Amino acid sequence: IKFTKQSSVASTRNTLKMAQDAERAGMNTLGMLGHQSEQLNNVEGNLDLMKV
Amino acid sequence: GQQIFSQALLNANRRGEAKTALAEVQARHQELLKLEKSMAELTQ
């Protein structure tokens, strides 16, 4: 019983670490996507100007 | 002029208490392993 509980503790520790892993990666993805969306907004403006 | 010893029986409730909660902790551990596996895939 004690060994199983210790194994459960270790499992939850790794799960938490990995969950934090997912979170940082996701926040970076959103940041980069906001920056790239904006570069594409700049692209959109020049395409409009070139149309005129 | 005489004396006597004494023996003892455990409580019925106890029963197989070694695994009364061992099965339960093992089942929860299996749940936690499933959780860990899913989190690993999500992080990937």
From Swiss-Prot, chain A:
t-SNARE coiled-coil homology domain span: 2-52
Taxonomically, the superkingdom here is Eukaryota
What family is reported?
A: Belongs to the SNAP-25 family.
The free-text function statement in the UniProt record for this protein reads:
Component of a SNARE complex that may be the effector of SEC4 function in exocytosis.
According to the record's subunit comment, the protein's assembly and interactions are: Interacts with SRO7 and SRO77.
Q: What is this protein called?
A: Protein transport protein SEC9
Q: Organism classification, top ranks? A: Eukaryota, Fungi, Dikarya, Ascomycota, Saccharomycotina
Gene encoding it? SEC9
Q: What range of the intact protein is shown?
A: 433 to 484 of 651
From Swiss-Prot, chain B:
Q: Where in the cell is it found?
A: Membrane
Q: Which family does it belong to?
A: Belongs to the syntaxin family.
What more does the entry say?
A: Present with 450 molecules/cell in log phase SD medium.
Q: What does this protein do?
A: Required for vesicle fusion with the plasma membrane.
Question: What is the name of this protein?
Answer: Protein SSO1
Q: Write down the species.
A: Saccharomyces cerevisiae (strain ATCC 204508 / S288c)
Q: Gene name?
A: SSO1
Which residues of the whole protein does the chain here span? 169 to 212 of 290
